[PDB]
Amino acid sequence: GCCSHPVCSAMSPIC
């Protein structure tokens, strides 16, 4: 998912 990629992972670290 997006949360599997650095930028989105920094948006939501809970994701």
Side-chain angles (χ1 to χ4, degrees):
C2 205
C3 302
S4 312
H5 184 72
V7 294
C8 319
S9 309
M11 299 300 175
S12 189
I14 306 178
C15 183

mmCIF file with all atom_site columns, all heavy atoms in Angstrom:
data_model
loop_
_atom_site.group_PDB
_atom_site.id
_atom_site.type_symbol
_atom_site.label_atom_id
_atom_site.label_alt_id
_atom_site.label_comp_id
_atom_site.label_asym_id
_atom_site.label_entity_id
_atom_site.label_seq_id
_atom_site.pdbx_PDB_ins_code
_atom_site.Cartn_x
_atom_site.Cartn_y
_atom_site.Cartn_z
_atom_site.occupancy
_atom_site.B_iso_or_equiv
_atom_site.pdbx_formal_charge
_atom_site.auth_seq_id
_atom_site.auth_comp_id
_atom_site.auth_asym_id
_atom_site.auth_atom_id
_atom_site.pdbx_PDB_model_num
ATOM 1  N N   . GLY A 1 1  ? 0.839  -1.203 0.000  1.00 0.00 ? 1  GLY A N   1
ATOM 2  C CA  . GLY A 1 1  ? 0.000  0.000  0.000  1.00 0.00 ? 1  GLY A CA  1
ATOM 3  C C   . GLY A 1 1  ? 0.856  1.228  0.000  1.00 0.00 ? 1  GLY A C   1
ATOM 4  O O   . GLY A 1 1  ? 2.059  1.121  -0.188 1.00 0.00 ? 1  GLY A O   1
ATOM 5  N N   . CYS A 1 2  ? 0.265  2.390  0.243  1.00 0.00 ? 2  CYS A N   1
ATOM 6  C CA  . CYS A 1 2  ? 1.013  3.651  0.258  1.00 0.00 ? 2  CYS A CA  1
ATOM 7  C C   . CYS A 1 2  ? 1.927  3.603  1.460  1.00 0.00 ? 2  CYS A C   1
ATOM 8  O O   . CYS A 1 2  ? 3.090  3.943  1.385  1.00 0.00 ? 2  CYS A O   1
ATOM 9  C CB  . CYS A 1 2  ? 0.040  4.836  0.410  1.00 0.00 ? 2  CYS A CB  1
ATOM 10 S SG  . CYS A 1 2  ? 0.583  6.490  -0.238 1.00 0.00 ? 2  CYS A SG  1
ATOM 11 N N   . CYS A 1 3  ? 1.393  3.087  2.562  1.00 0.00 ? 3  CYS A N   1
ATOM 12 C CA  . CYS A 1 3  ? 2.101  2.976  3.842  1.00 0.00 ? 3  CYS A CA  1
ATOM 13 C C   . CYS A 1 3  ? 3.283  1.996  3.793  1.00 0.00 ? 3  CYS A C   1
ATOM 14 O O   . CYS A 1 3  ? 3.981  1.778  4.783  1.00 0.00 ? 3  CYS A O   1
ATOM 15 C CB  . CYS A 1 3  ? 1.122  2.547  4.894  1.00 0.00 ? 3  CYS A CB  1
ATOM 16 S SG  . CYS A 1 3  ? -0.288 3.686  5.089  1.00 0.00 ? 3  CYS A SG  1
ATOM 17 N N   . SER A 1 4  ? 3.472  1.419  2.657  1.00 0.00 ? 4  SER A N   1
ATOM 18 C CA  . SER A 1 4  ? 4.578  0.533  2.386  1.00 0.00 ? 4  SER A CA  1
ATOM 19 C C   . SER A 1 4  ? 5.696  1.324  1.670  1.00 0.00 ? 4  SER A C   1
ATOM 20 O O   . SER A 1 4  ? 6.713  0.766  1.248  1.00 0.00 ? 4  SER A O   1
ATOM 21 C CB  . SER A 1 4  ? 4.089  -0.597 1.481  1.00 0.00 ? 4  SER A CB  1
ATOM 22 O OG  . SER A 1 4  ? 2.867  -1.146 1.978  1.00 0.00 ? 4  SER A OG  1
ATOM 23 N N   . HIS A 1 5  ? 5.510  2.620  1.553  1.00 0.00 ? 5  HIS A N   1
ATOM 24 C CA  . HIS A 1 5  ? 6.434  3.462  0.848  1.00 0.00 ? 5  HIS A CA  1
ATOM 25 C C   . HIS A 1 5  ? 6.761  4.686  1.694  1.00 0.00 ? 5  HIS A C   1
ATOM 26 O O   . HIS A 1 5  ? 5.848  5.421  2.090  1.00 0.00 ? 5  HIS A O   1
ATOM 27 C CB  . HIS A 1 5  ? 5.847  3.853  -0.523 1.00 0.00 ? 5  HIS A CB  1
ATOM 28 C CG  . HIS A 1 5  ? 6.766  4.661  -1.392 1.00 0.00 ? 5  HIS A CG  1
ATOM 29 N ND1 . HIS A 1 5  ? 7.882  4.153  -2.016 1.00 0.00 ? 5  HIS A ND1 1
ATOM 30 C CD2 . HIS A 1 5  ? 6.718  5.963  -1.721 1.00 0.00 ? 5  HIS A CD2 1
ATOM 31 C CE1 . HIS A 1 5  ? 8.474  5.141  -2.688 1.00 0.00 ? 5  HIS A CE1 1
ATOM 32 N NE2 . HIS A 1 5  ? 7.801  6.271  -2.542 1.00 0.00 ? 5  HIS A NE2 1
ATOM 33 N N   . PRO A 1 6  ? 8.086  4.916  1.942  1.00 0.00 ? 6  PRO A N   1
ATOM 34 C CA  . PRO A 1 6  ? 8.649  5.959  2.820  1.00 0.00 ? 6  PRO A CA  1
ATOM 35 C C   . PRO A 1 6  ? 7.797  7.220  3.059  1.00 0.00 ? 6  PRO A C   1
ATOM 36 O O   . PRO A 1 6  ? 7.539  7.580  4.215  1.00 0.00 ? 6  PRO A O   1
ATOM 37 C CB  . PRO A 1 6  ? 9.939  6.307  2.105  1.00 0.00 ? 6  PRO A CB  1
ATOM 38 C CG  . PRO A 1 6  ? 10.422 4.998  1.571  1.00 0.00 ? 6  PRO A CG  1
ATOM 39 C CD  . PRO A 1 6  ? 9.194  4.129  1.348  1.00 0.00 ? 6  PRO A CD  1
ATOM 40 N N   . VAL A 1 7  ? 7.363  7.878  1.995  1.00 0.00 ? 7  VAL A N   1
ATOM 41 C CA  . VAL A 1 7  ? 6.618  9.124  2.140  1.00 0.00 ? 7  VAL A CA  1
ATOM 42 C C   . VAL A 1 7  ? 5.256  8.947  2.833  1.00 0.00 ? 7  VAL A C   1
ATOM 43 O O   . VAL A 1 7  ? 4.923  9.713  3.731  1.00 0.00 ? 7  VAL A O   1
ATOM 44 C CB  . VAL A 1 7  ? 6.488  9.926  0.814  1.00 0.00 ? 7  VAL A CB  1
ATOM 45 C CG1 . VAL A 1 7  ? 7.857  10.414 0.368  1.00 0.00 ? 7  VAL A CG1 1
ATOM 46 C CG2 . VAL A 1 7  ? 5.861  9.088  -0.285 1.00 0.00 ? 7  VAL A CG2 1
ATOM 47 N N   . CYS A 1 8  ? 4.512  7.909  2.483  1.00 0.00 ? 8  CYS A N   1
ATOM 48 C CA  . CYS A 1 8  ? 3.201  7.693  3.094  1.00 0.00 ? 8  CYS A CA  1
ATOM 49 C C   . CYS A 1 8  ? 3.400  7.123  4.495  1.00 0.00 ? 8  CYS A C   1
ATOM 50 O O   . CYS A 1 8  ? 2.618  7.394  5.416  1.00 0.00 ? 8  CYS A O   1
ATOM 51 C CB  . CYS A 1 8  ? 2.364  6.711  2.282  1.00 0.00 ? 8  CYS A CB  1
ATOM 52 S SG  . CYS A 1 8  ? 2.463  6.900  0.466  1.00 0.00 ? 8  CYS A SG  1
ATOM 53 N N   . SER A 1 9  ? 4.481  6.360  4.653  1.00 0.00 ? 9  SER A N   1
ATOM 54 C CA  . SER A 1 9  ? 4.846  5.752  5.913  1.00 0.00 ? 9  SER A CA  1
ATOM 55 C C   . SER A 1 9  ? 5.190  6.828  6.971  1.00 0.00 ? 9  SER A C   1
ATOM 56 O O   . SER A 1 9  ? 5.076  6.604  8.179  1.00 0.00 ? 9  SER A O   1
ATOM 57 C CB  . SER A 1 9  ? 6.045  4.849  5.684  1.00 0.00 ? 9  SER A CB  1
ATOM 58 O OG  . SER A 1 9  ? 5.798  3.974  4.605  1.00 0.00 ? 9  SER A OG  1
ATOM 59 N N   . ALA A 1 10 ? 5.621  7.991  6.503  1.00 0.00 ? 10 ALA A N   1
ATOM 60 C CA  . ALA A 1 10 ? 5.943  9.096  7.388  1.00 0.00 ? 10 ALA A CA  1
ATOM 61 C C   . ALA A 1 10 ? 4.711  9.948  7.651  1.00 0.00 ? 10 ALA A C   1
ATOM 62 O O   . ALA A 1 10 ? 4.687  10.769 8.576  1.00 0.00 ? 10 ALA A O   1
ATOM 63 C CB  . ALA A 1 10 ? 7.064  9.934  6.808  1.00 0.00 ? 10 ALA A CB  1
ATOM 64 N N   . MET A 1 11 ? 3.688  9.763  6.834  1.00 0.00 ? 11 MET A N   1
ATOM 65 C CA  . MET A 1 11 ? 2.437  10.477 7.025  1.00 0.00 ? 11 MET A CA  1
ATOM 66 C C   . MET A 1 11 ? 1.733  9.869  8.189  1.00 0.00 ? 11 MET A C   1
ATOM 67 O O   . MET A 1 11 ? 1.368  10.540 9.149  1.00 0.00 ? 11 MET A O   1
ATOM 68 C CB  . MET A 1 11 ? 1.541  10.432 5.773  1.00 0.00 ? 11 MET A CB  1
ATOM 69 C CG  . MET A 1 11 ? 2.163  11.061 4.542  1.00 0.00 ? 11 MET A CG  1
ATOM 70 S SD  . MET A 1 11 ? 2.561  12.800 4.778  1.00 0.00 ? 11 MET A SD  1
ATOM 71 C CE  . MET A 1 11 ? 3.378  13.160 3.227  1.00 0.00 ? 11 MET A CE  1
ATOM 72 N N   . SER A 1 12 ? 1.611  8.599  8.120  1.00 0.00 ? 12 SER A N   1
ATOM 73 C CA  . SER A 1 12 ? 1.006  7.842  9.144  1.00 0.00 ? 12 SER A CA  1
ATOM 74 C C   . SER A 1 12 ? 1.914  6.680  9.501  1.00 0.00 ? 12 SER A C   1
ATOM 75 O O   . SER A 1 12 ? 1.959  5.677  8.789  1.00 0.00 ? 12 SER A O   1
ATOM 76 C CB  . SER A 1 12 ? -0.337 7.327  8.676  1.00 0.00 ? 12 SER A CB  1
ATOM 77 O OG  . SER A 1 12 ? -1.065 6.734  9.739  1.00 0.00 ? 12 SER A OG  1
ATOM 78 N N   . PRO A 1 13 ? 2.666  6.792  10.600 1.00 0.00 ? 13 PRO A N   1
ATOM 79 C CA  . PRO A 1 13 ? 3.563  5.735  11.037 1.00 0.00 ? 13 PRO A CA  1
ATOM 80 C C   . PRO A 1 13 ? 2.801  4.626  11.757 1.00 0.00 ? 13 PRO A C   1
ATOM 81 O O   . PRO A 1 13 ? 3.355  3.611  12.140 1.00 0.00 ? 13 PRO A O   1
ATOM 82 C CB  . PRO A 1 13 ? 4.527  6.445  11.986 1.00 0.00 ? 13 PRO A CB  1
ATOM 83 C CG  . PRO A 1 13 ? 3.801  7.650  12.481 1.00 0.00 ? 13 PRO A CG  1
ATOM 84 C CD  . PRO A 1 13 ? 2.710  7.964  11.490 1.00 0.00 ? 13 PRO A CD  1
ATOM 85 N N   . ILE A 1 14 ? 1.512  4.831  11.919 1.00 0.00 ? 14 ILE A N   1
ATOM 86 C CA  . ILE A 1 14 ? 0.670  3.871  12.576 1.00 0.00 ? 14 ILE A CA  1
ATOM 87 C C   . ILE A 1 14 ? 0.062  2.949  11.515 1.00 0.00 ? 14 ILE A C   1
ATOM 88 O O   . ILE A 1 14 ? -0.500 1.888  11.798 1.00 0.00 ? 14 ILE A O   1
ATOM 89 C CB  . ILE A 1 14 ? -0.418 4.581  13.440 1.00 0.00 ? 14 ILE A CB  1
ATOM 90 C CG1 . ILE A 1 14 ? 0.259  5.571  14.408 1.00 0.00 ? 14 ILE A CG1 1
ATOM 91 C CG2 . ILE A 1 14 ? -1.248 3.568  14.229 1.00 0.00 ? 14 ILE A CG2 1
ATOM 92 C CD1 . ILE A 1 14 ? -0.701 6.358  15.277 1.00 0.00 ? 14 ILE A CD1 1
ATOM 93 N N   . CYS A 1 15 ? 0.255  3.343  10.306 1.00 0.00 ? 15 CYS A N   1
ATOM 94 C CA  . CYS A 1 15 ? -0.214 2.632  9.160  1.00 0.00 ? 15 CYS A CA  1
ATOM 95 C C   . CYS A 1 15 ? 0.910  1.745  8.646  1.00 0.00 ? 15 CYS A C   1
ATOM 96 O O   . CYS A 1 15 ? 1.884  2.229  8.060  1.00 0.00 ? 15 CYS A O   1
ATOM 97 C CB  . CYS A 1 15 ? -0.666 3.621  8.083  1.00 0.00 ? 15 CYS A CB  1
ATOM 98 S SG  . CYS A 1 15 ? -1.372 2.865  6.585  1.00 0.00 ? 15 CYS A SG  1
#
